[PDB]
Design a protein around this ligand. Structure first.
Ligand SMILES: [Mg+2]
Ligand SMILES: [Mg+2]
Ligand SMILES: [Mg+2]
Ligand SMILES: [Mg+2]
Ligand SMILES: [Mg+2]
Ligand SMILES: [Mg+2]
Ligand SMILES: [Mg+2]
Ligand SMILES: [Mg+2]
Ligand SMILES: [Mg+2]
Ligand SMILES: [Mg+2]
Ligand SMILES: [Mg+2]
Ligand SMILES: [Mg+2]
Ligand SMILES: [Mg+2]
Ligand SMILES: [Mg+2]
Ligand SMILES: [Mg+2]
Ligand SMILES: [Mg+2]
Ligand SMILES: [Mg+2]
Ligand SMILES: [Mg+2]
Ligand SMILES: [Mg+2]
Ligand SMILES: [Mg+2]
Ligand SMILES: [Mg+2]
Ligand SMILES: [Mg+2]
Ligand SMILES: [Mg+2]
Ligand SMILES: [Mg+2]
Ligand SMILES: [Mg+2]
Ligand SMILES: [Mg+2]
Ligand SMILES: [Mg+2]
Ligand SMILES: [Mg+2]
Ligand SMILES: [Mg+2]
Ligand SMILES: [Mg+2]
Ligand SMILES: [Mg+2]
Ligand SMILES: [Mg+2]
Ligand SMILES: [Mg+2]
Lengths: 134, 260, 182
RNA sequence: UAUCUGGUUGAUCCUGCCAGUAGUCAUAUGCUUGUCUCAAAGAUUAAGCCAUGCAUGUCUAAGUAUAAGCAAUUUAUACAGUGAAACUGCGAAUGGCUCAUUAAAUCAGUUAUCGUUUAUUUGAUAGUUCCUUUACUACAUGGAUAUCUGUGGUAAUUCUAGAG
RNA sequence: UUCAUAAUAACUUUUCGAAUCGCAUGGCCUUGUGCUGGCGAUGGUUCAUUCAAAUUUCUGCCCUAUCAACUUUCGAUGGUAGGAUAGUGGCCUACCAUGGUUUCAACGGGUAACGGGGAAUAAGGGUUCGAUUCCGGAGAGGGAGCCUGAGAAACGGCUACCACAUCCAAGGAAGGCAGCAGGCGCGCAAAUUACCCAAUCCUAAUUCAGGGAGGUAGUGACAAUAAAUAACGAUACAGGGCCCAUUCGGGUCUUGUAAUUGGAAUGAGUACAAUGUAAAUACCUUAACGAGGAACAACUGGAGGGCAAGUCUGGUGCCAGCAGCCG
């Protein structure tokens, strides 16, 4: 009596982005939300596409449980999904990796520190070293 | 302000772009281009909002960059291009062609229009002057400067640019009893026939317009755009043909044409 | 700076705060329909006053005037859709004759009481507040809800609720577990 | 969302105000405070003073590459890949904050520029640069200059002088 | 219109008229590095168009006469010529004229006055407010001066004075929070040195970089919306419609009051998860827990009148105190 059933309303093709856009209306009684990865797979074999060229987001389980609604897209190829989707969706789905970024404050600190020096700092480092030498 | 202004807050955007007053502090300021920003329509608004082909700014940027949008036969890869009135937007994907004409509520409605006629565009003549070395030229509302026009083409007239070569194909002379469009004010989107054009020595010409439903109004001549001869428009008019049904008549249309 | 969305008051406390007859009438209406506070009667009176200001303004206008027609029949269709104004008196002159009790009567509280699935008004209030009644498969935990005519036929206990058919709940499940264990 | 009530008198009718009453996207404050949505917020006195950290830098296939930076592998005898730095170009005059000055001043509605400047965006736009043409680089004219290599100065500052 | 434009004569310490980059590198054979040749990118004179910027016409401003005449030698009103201006213009200069505003309030003074769209209030007429989410204006401690550019009299651009200050090796150097945070002070009076470019957009050579613009969270009883703090039985103490009225009285028919007594439902909280989000909270959903004095305990004011509710009990005795007013 689980029978998670899925529907794609307002589906529009879009070769401008080589995609198919729709709103995901998922009916699921006696159950919590649909755990996106599982519904991505469901749309994958629903539209005859790989689990990589399918994306869902913006979900909202309506008041009182049961129905839930989100937005979904099906890309023509996995490469197009790679080259068109935002980085954070490619991180959610495991097809990309979080970029090793320093925090914003440290980046700004380093930007100002680079501002302090005109040109490469190769000369000034040795100059200062031999300066405090004497 | 000391110099030009480059930000357009969302509430200050025209009520014909008719965006959501929430979900954003600013609005797309149209870059300098063929149309007044108050009268124009940015490509990002036309795609993200009107067509919903995109979802947000990055998607619109990716759409425009790969040269799928063609404004009047040219690519126009900038996000806030002022695609104004009567311009033609071509998407080779979905092989679709749009011409921007106001729906009678007074808004840039999505008008899917055929490929065959999409080859050309119409334009209003705003100036007829004589440039250097004695060459006559005509300035349209797009800012297109067409060189060597027909000798009896005058101001306020209308002309039919082939949009491929960008030269003069045919033109329609402004005079009484002629099918006409309105491009500003309360009468946005309205289509009718010129009954009289009172001269008003000293400025601000006015014209009286009677539409098919036999309703009559009056509009400034700057605000007027001849579109053809009665019964024979030179373009494909949008759905409803700009009759401006009354609010009660609109309610009756909602009630009558209704199936669920 | 982002464009504000307008908050607005929905009630108006009366001028004379200690009118004996008015206080007794307010308590009568609160006890008849299980209203939590007397702000509820103020809110219904404010809604009635807004409707009534619109009605009188439209009445002042001349008969067979586009404003009169459009907005008057819009208001009448909205009120008959709510159900407070009976179909007999769609005239815009009986619309002034509506009383606060009429809008009180269309509350989901009183509607659940009328249908009989709640045998007491306070029972209707708690049953609504416990997420049991669903107006067309949609659970409504809100007593007023201004139940409309077209959807009153679809009030019943929700499927997720034990009354509509589900697991009983904390007390009964715990007692069943205790009985099974011992 | 057309309403009044207590108080001058032994008692009355008034004029009259005080007080009561209900607000307040008007704050402050007191006592309480369980939930969901939503949200103002160092304006009033001090446009008073500020430590500290950020708030504007920017490169596409397409201006300049000899980082003696990275890649050296399938594309590599000038150069192609990626790319610090610097020169070049552009923005930095947008945005954000405050209401101190200002009473035909600003501003609002409505005009005018046949009284002017306008990067940019968009549409067009030029044979003559010969000067007596019977001797010219047009198959491409010249010199610096940053970056860099090295020597310093000052206690220190986005301080930079000398040389190649 | 002396406009657009054209023409003649001339003038210029003579502006522009591509010595610039990417990709593809086709065709002709004059078969050579030969001749030509596409799509773009940057430039570039002029004229338009757009973003604009400057000025500009009419009308509209709060209080004050215990401000009735104000302005002109130092421009006050006008004329002309010149200078400057991007351009008109006493905008400035030279020479002339002696003018311009005013009881329809000029000029002066005050504004704890930025103007407006608007807010509160609401029978109608109005009164008060509008520092602040949008449009304009002005300012960056107060003043002046200026380079660069198309655009600044810029101030997260410079120069100097005044005020206030900082490091100092006492020679010098560097200042601008009415930006986001935060601090001192002030005062009745107002927030975390947080996350991030996800969304709105903006800048740039331009997708990619950047953005305390902005969004997200933190505090937040400024205001605003919906709304938990119990609900239903079975019993004992009762009350009303009663079959009549032998006193009755069954309670025949119902409605409350009792530390009696039962079975239910549910959140406020915790919390597997998943959704949410740039990542996280939080909300919507939901496992597993989570109500008996359901201690998971609602206060703030008042009980003479105005004004709803006590001439109950104890205390103090025109004290203490209460009282917006009468008391
Ligand atoms: Mg600004
Ligand atoms: Mg009155
Ligand atoms: Mg007396
Ligand atoms: Mg007395
Ligand atoms: Mg009073
Ligand atoms: Mg909850
Ligand atoms: Mg202040
Ligand atoms: Mg630079
Ligand atoms: Mg490169
Ligand atoms: Mg004054
Ligand atoms: Mg001329
Ligand atoms: Mg002059
Ligand atoms: Mg002031
Ligand atoms: Mg203001
Ligand atoms: Mg004001
Ligand atoms: Mg002030
Ligand atoms: Mg402003
Ligand atoms: Mg300034
Ligand atoms: Mg200051
Ligand atoms: Mg510039
Ligand atoms: Mg300054
Ligand atoms: Mg600053
Ligand atoms: Mg600034
Ligand atoms: Mg500087
Ligand atoms: Mg601050
Ligand atoms: Mg901010
Ligand atoms: Mg406060
Ligand atoms: Mg809190
Ligand atoms: Mg409690
Ligand atoms: Mg009490
Ligand atoms: Mg007391
Ligand atoms: Mg007492
Ligand atoms: Mg009383």
């Amino acid at each position: 009596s689980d029978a998670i059933t899925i529907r794609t309303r307002k589906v529009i093709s879009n070769p401008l982005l080589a995609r198919k856009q729709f709103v995901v209306d998922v009916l699921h009684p006696n159950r919590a939300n649909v755990s996106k990865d599982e519904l991505r797979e469901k749309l994958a074999e629903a539209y005859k596409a790989e689990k990589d060229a399918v994306s869902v987001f913006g979900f909202r389980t309506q008041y009182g449980g049961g129905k839930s609604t989100g937005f979904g897209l099906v890309y023509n190829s996995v490469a197009d999904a790679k080259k068109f989707e935002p980085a954070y969706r490619l991180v959610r789905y495991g097809l990309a990796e979080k970029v090793e970024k320093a925090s914003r404050q440290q980046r700004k600190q380093r930007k100002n520190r680079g501002k302090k020096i005109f040109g490469t700092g190769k000369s000034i480092a040795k100059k200062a070293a031999r300066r405090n030498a004497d | 302000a000391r110099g030009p202004k480059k930000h357009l807050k969302r509430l200050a955007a025209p009520h014909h772009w008719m965006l959501d007053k929430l979900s954003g502090c600013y609005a797309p300021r149209p870059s300098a281009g063929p149309h007044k920003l108050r009268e124009s329509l940015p490509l990002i608004v036309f795609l993200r909002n009107r067509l919903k082909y995109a979802l947000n700014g990055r998607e619109v940027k990716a759409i425009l960059m790969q040269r799928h949008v063609k404004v009047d036969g040219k690519v126009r890869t900038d996000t806030t291009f002022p695609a104004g009135f009567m311009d033609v937007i071509t998407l080779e994907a979905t092989n679709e062609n749009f011409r921007l004409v106001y729906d009678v509520k007074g808004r840039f409605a999505v008008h899917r229009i055929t490929d065959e006629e999409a080859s050309y565009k119409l334009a209003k003549v705003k100036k007829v002057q004589l440039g250097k070395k004695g060459i006559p030229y005509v300035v349209t509302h797009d800012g297109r400067t067409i060189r060597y026009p027909d000798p009896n083409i005058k101001v306020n007239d209308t002309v039919k640019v082939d949009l491929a070569t960008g030269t003069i194909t045919d033109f329609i002379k402004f005079d009484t009893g002629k099918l006409v469009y309105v491009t500003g004010g309360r009468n946005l989107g309205r289509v009718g026939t010129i009954v009289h054009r009172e001269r008003h020595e000293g400025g601000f010409d006015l014209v009286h317009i009677k539409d098919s439903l036999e309703n009559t109004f009056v509009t400034r001549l700057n605000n007027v755009f001849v579109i053809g001869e009665p019964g024979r428009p030179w373009i494909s008019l949008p759905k409803g043909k700009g009759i401006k049904l009354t609010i009660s008549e609109e309610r009756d249309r909602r009630r009558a044409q209704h199936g669920l | 700076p982002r464009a504000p969305r307008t908050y607005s008051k929905t009630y108006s406390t009366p001028k004379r705060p200690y009118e004996s007859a008015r206080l007794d009438a307010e308590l009568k209406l609160a006890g008849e329909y299980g209203l939590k506070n007397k702000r509820e009667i103020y809110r219904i009176s404010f809604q009635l006053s807004k409707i009534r200001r619109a009605a009188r303004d439209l009445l002042t206008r001349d008969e067979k005037d586009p404003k009169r027609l459009f907005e008057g029949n819009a208001l009448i269709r909205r009120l008959v859709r709510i159900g407070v104004l009976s179909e007999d008196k769609k005239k815009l002159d009986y619309v002034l004759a509506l009383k606060v009790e009429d809008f009180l009567e269309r509350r989901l509280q009183t509607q659940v009481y009328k249908l009989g699935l709640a045998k007491s008004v306070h029972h209707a209030r708690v049953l609504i507040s416990q997420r049991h009644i669903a107006v067309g498969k949609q659970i409504v935990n809100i007593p007023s809800f201004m139940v409309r005519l077209e959807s009153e036929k679809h009030i019943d206990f929700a499927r997720t609720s034990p009354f509509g058919g589900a697991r009983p709940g904390r007390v009964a499940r715990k007692r069943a577990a205790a009985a099974g264990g011992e």
